[PDB]
């Protein structure tokens, strides 16, 4: 498929695997919002 | 000092510089509470 | 439509107007994923 | 003691008890850093 070039691309070292999964959820959250930006104004 | 056994160490790609600073903030947030887990709750 | 059984309904006092808008953003974030829990993951 | 001028005070309806405990955790997180804003960064 090859996705287009999105915004920049940084990284973050999250210590502790427990809190790691927690941050991952927040990442996907904002990710879906960005995809809803190109969606209808509704 | 600091911590004997360090937890795992993963990483996360944060697209977008604006949202990046947002996640980094939460990172130090949880890290602070971790240092408070040393002395019992008071 | 929307959702048959609504989950519980609590509340939270957010001190500071600046940080307030920050939490509200995460609120709608999780709410969006909840609506996606209807159709299987794809 | 504590803080002279308290910031504003709003509220937020968190649907779902599971996600509720999640937001509450981040609440105390930012509150802790606020108390550290007293002494310069070190």
PDB file of N, CA and C in Angstrom, chain C residues 8-37:
ATOM      1  N   UNK C   8     -21.309   3.623  33.309  1.00  0.00           N
ATOM      2  CA  UNK C   8     -21.551   4.498  34.490  1.00  0.00           C
ATOM      3  C   UNK C   8     -21.356   5.960  34.082  1.00  0.00           C
ATOM      4  N   UNK C   9     -21.522   6.868  35.001  1.00  0.00           N
ATOM      5  CA  UNK C   9     -21.346   8.308  34.664  1.00  0.00           C
ATOM      6  C   UNK C   9     -20.793   9.051  35.881  1.00  0.00           C
ATOM      7  N   UNK C  10     -19.503   9.231  35.936  1.00  0.00           N
ATOM      8  CA  UNK C  10     -18.901   9.943  37.097  1.00  0.00           C
ATOM      9  C   UNK C  10     -18.534  11.370  36.689  1.00  0.00           C
ATOM     10  N   UNK C  11     -17.663  11.996  37.427  1.00  0.00           N
ATOM     11  CA  UNK C  11     -17.255  13.388  37.089  1.00  0.00           C
ATOM     12  C   UNK C  11     -15.852  13.642  37.641  1.00  0.00           C
ATOM     13  N   UNK C  12     -15.241  14.729  37.261  1.00  0.00           N
ATOM     14  CA  UNK C  12     -13.870  15.016  37.767  1.00  0.00           C
ATOM     15  C   UNK C  12     -13.641  16.527  37.812  1.00  0.00           C
ATOM     16  N   UNK C  13     -13.116  17.022  38.901  1.00  0.00           N
ATOM     17  CA  UNK C  13     -12.860  18.485  39.005  1.00  0.00           C
ATOM     18  C   UNK C  13     -11.493  18.797  38.394  1.00  0.00           C
ATOM     19  N   UNK C  14     -11.464  19.554  37.333  1.00  0.00           N
ATOM     20  CA  UNK C  14     -10.159  19.883  36.691  1.00  0.00           C
ATOM     21  C   UNK C  14      -9.750  21.310  37.052  1.00  0.00           C
ATOM     22  N   UNK C  15      -8.807  21.458  37.942  1.00  0.00           N
ATOM     23  CA  UNK C  15      -8.358  22.823  38.333  1.00  0.00           C
ATOM     24  C   UNK C  15      -7.540  23.434  37.193  1.00  0.00           C
ATOM     25  N   UNK C  16      -7.737  24.692  36.914  1.00  0.00           N
ATOM     26  CA  UNK C  16      -6.965  25.341  35.816  1.00  0.00           C
ATOM     27  C   UNK C  16      -7.742  25.224  34.503  1.00  0.00           C
ATOM     28  N   UNK C  17      -7.908  26.315  33.806  1.00  0.00           N
ATOM     29  CA  UNK C  17      -8.657  26.270  32.517  1.00  0.00           C
ATOM     30  C   UNK C  17      -7.745  25.729  31.413  1.00  0.00           C
ATOM     31  N   UNK C  18      -6.491  26.092  31.436  1.00  0.00           N
ATOM     32  CA  UNK C  18      -5.552  25.603  30.388  1.00  0.00           C
ATOM     33  C   UNK C  18      -5.527  24.073  30.389  1.00  0.00           C
ATOM     34  N   UNK C  19      -5.135  23.476  31.481  1.00  0.00           N
ATOM     35  CA  UNK C  19      -5.088  21.989  31.539  1.00  0.00           C
ATOM     36  C   UNK C  19      -6.486  21.419  31.291  1.00  0.00           C
ATOM     37  N   UNK C  20      -7.508  22.156  31.633  1.00  0.00           N
ATOM     38  CA  UNK C  20      -8.890  21.650  31.413  1.00  0.00           C
ATOM     39  C   UNK C  20      -9.061  21.255  29.945  1.00  0.00           C
ATOM     40  N   UNK C  21      -8.892  22.185  29.046  1.00  0.00           N
ATOM     41  CA  UNK C  21      -9.047  21.862  27.599  1.00  0.00           C
ATOM     42  C   UNK C  21      -8.195  20.638  27.247  1.00  0.00           C
ATOM     43  N   UNK C  22      -7.089  20.459  27.918  1.00  0.00           N
ATOM     44  CA  UNK C  22      -6.215  19.289  27.616  1.00  0.00           C
ATOM     45  C   UNK C  22      -6.954  17.989  27.939  1.00  0.00           C
ATOM     46  N   UNK C  23      -7.475  17.867  29.128  1.00  0.00           N
ATOM     47  CA  UNK C  23      -8.199  16.618  29.500  1.00  0.00           C
ATOM     48  C   UNK C  23      -9.413  16.431  28.587  1.00  0.00           C
ATOM     49  N   UNK C  24     -10.196  17.460  28.403  1.00  0.00           N
ATOM     50  CA  UNK C  24     -11.397  17.340  27.527  1.00  0.00           C
ATOM     51  C   UNK C  24     -11.003  16.710  26.189  1.00  0.00           C
ATOM     52  N   UNK C  25      -9.872  17.082  25.654  1.00  0.00           N
ATOM     53  CA  UNK C  25      -9.439  16.507  24.350  1.00  0.00           C
ATOM     54  C   UNK C  25      -9.317  14.985  24.471  1.00  0.00           C
ATOM     55  N   UNK C  26      -8.633  14.514  25.477  1.00  0.00           N
ATOM     56  CA  UNK C  26      -8.476  13.041  25.644  1.00  0.00           C
ATOM     57  C   UNK C  26      -9.849  12.397  25.845  1.00  0.00           C
ATOM     58  N   UNK C  27     -10.763  13.105  26.447  1.00  0.00           N
ATOM     59  CA  UNK C  27     -12.121  12.534  26.674  1.00  0.00           C
ATOM     60  C   UNK C  27     -12.736  12.131  25.332  1.00  0.00           C
ATOM     61  N   UNK C  28     -12.858  13.062  24.427  1.00  0.00           N
ATOM     62  CA  UNK C  28     -13.452  12.739  23.100  1.00  0.00           C
ATOM     63  C   UNK C  28     -12.596  11.682  22.395  1.00  0.00           C
ATOM     64  N   UNK C  29     -11.322  11.657  22.669  1.00  0.00           N
ATOM     65  CA  UNK C  29     -10.436  10.654  22.013  1.00  0.00           C
ATOM     66  C   UNK C  29     -10.919   9.238  22.344  1.00  0.00           C
ATOM     67  N   UNK C  30     -10.984   8.899  23.603  1.00  0.00           N
ATOM     68  CA  UNK C  30     -11.439   7.532  23.986  1.00  0.00           C
ATOM     69  C   UNK C  30     -12.877   7.312  23.507  1.00  0.00           C
ATOM     70  N   UNK C  31     -13.702   8.318  23.596  1.00  0.00           N
ATOM     71  CA  UNK C  31     -15.119   8.167  23.156  1.00  0.00           C
ATOM     72  C   UNK C  31     -15.168   7.744  21.685  1.00  0.00           C
ATOM     73  N   UNK C  32     -14.296   8.270  20.872  1.00  0.00           N
ATOM     74  CA  UNK C  32     -14.305   7.896  19.429  1.00  0.00           C
ATOM     75  C   UNK C  32     -14.013   6.402  19.282  1.00  0.00           C
ATOM     76  N   UNK C  33     -12.989   5.921  19.929  1.00  0.00           N
ATOM     77  CA  UNK C  33     -12.654   4.473  19.822  1.00  0.00           C
ATOM     78  C   UNK C  33     -13.841   3.635  20.303  1.00  0.00           C
ATOM     79  N   UNK C  34     -14.529   4.091  21.312  1.00  0.00           N
ATOM     80  CA  UNK C  34     -15.696   3.323  21.830  1.00  0.00           C
ATOM     81  C   UNK C  34     -16.698   3.084  20.699  1.00  0.00           C
ATOM     82  N   UNK C  35     -16.942   4.079  19.890  1.00  0.00           N
ATOM     83  CA  UNK C  35     -17.915   3.913  18.773  1.00  0.00           C
ATOM     84  C   UNK C  35     -17.361   2.929  17.740  1.00  0.00           C
ATOM     85  N   UNK C  36     -16.067   2.759  17.695  1.00  0.00           N
ATOM     86  CA  UNK C  36     -15.477   1.815  16.703  1.00  0.00           C
ATOM     87  C   UNK C  36     -15.533   0.386  17.253  1.00  0.00           C
ATOM     88  N   UNK C  37     -15.853   0.233  18.508  1.00  0.00           N
ATOM     89  CA  UNK C  37     -15.924  -1.135  19.099  1.00  0.00           C
ATOM     90  C   UNK C  37     -17.160  -1.868  18.570  1.00  0.00           C
TER      91      UNK C  37
END
